Amino acid sequence: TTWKEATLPQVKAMLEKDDGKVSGDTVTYSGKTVHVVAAAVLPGFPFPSFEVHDKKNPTLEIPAGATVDVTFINTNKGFGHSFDITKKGPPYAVMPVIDPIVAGTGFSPVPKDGKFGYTDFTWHPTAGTYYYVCQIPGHAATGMFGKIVVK
Template sequence: MRSYFFVVSLVLMLGGSFSFNTTVSATNMMGGSQMMGGKGNMKGNMMGGSQMMNKMRNLSTISINELKSFYKIPVAGVRINKKTNTVKFLDSKITIPIIASPDEDNMYAFGVYGLVNPTIVVKEGSVITIKLVNKDDDMPHAIMITKTQPPYNNMPMMMNSVAFGGAVIMPIPKKSNSGYYVDSTTFTATTPGVYYYICQIPGHAAKGMYGKFVVLK
């Protein structure tokens, strides 16, 4: 039963639909490919479907050299405090480069300017672009900002809503032969408060893949 709900949640998270009948068929928006591959068969055709979805989203890839730009700290507009593990953005129009699974010791974590799962602080009304790259060579990762605080269960996307319109990036595939996949989203931090950025892939936030996101008045 847990496996069933995992598949349902994953299909919904990838933008698909699910029909609840005795054969449990899944038809997603990725060219009508079937995820279940037949009655009770969990193999399916996720690979082909995800490739089509990547094209629809216009996902790009970057090389290892281009990945270095995610670690480069801007000269102005950002304050980094390693002692408090905080990144504070001072401008009203900002880009936050985030690395999913920044290294082998932090597979279930986000990296921002060399810090792991830091508290990100922005100003109310800031127009924010999150640029997420997946450095993981084993699994996909994603990100969303939610008001719900930890701890998180294994299905965070079923329990948490997006805090701001557009403050979500759907799953980004693992590293491929062409490089690291990158996606981005832009939103406005309209309301002051304490929020959290989490990976909504099943089980990832529960394993610690989240950080605090603070909007100051």
């Protein structure tokens, strides 16, 4: 996919653009268009994991019919995590069999020269349960995934 580069202050600014509301380990979105901003292993969080709205691998609740704008930022030095959406649930093998990927980013570039790679994609899901996972061998198997409920 097409990756762009952002400086640290830029990363901070984007993270706060997630318009979901957190409740426990759940982030609920509302409206015609929703904006999900996910990051791979923010400093201080467990490895390996995804952070959405400052929460570790939270369950995302999206209204059916809404246009989902996803922004994925890889803030983890040394690894090129991915954010791929599939219908296949856990447990995941070391080499996850999650085809077909409904929407996703593919492997991201590793942080370099004081910048972090990020990308944006749109998704118009049908009601159902999906999962966002990282395809780097072993990551999903060690907990790098979360659930998406479209209802």
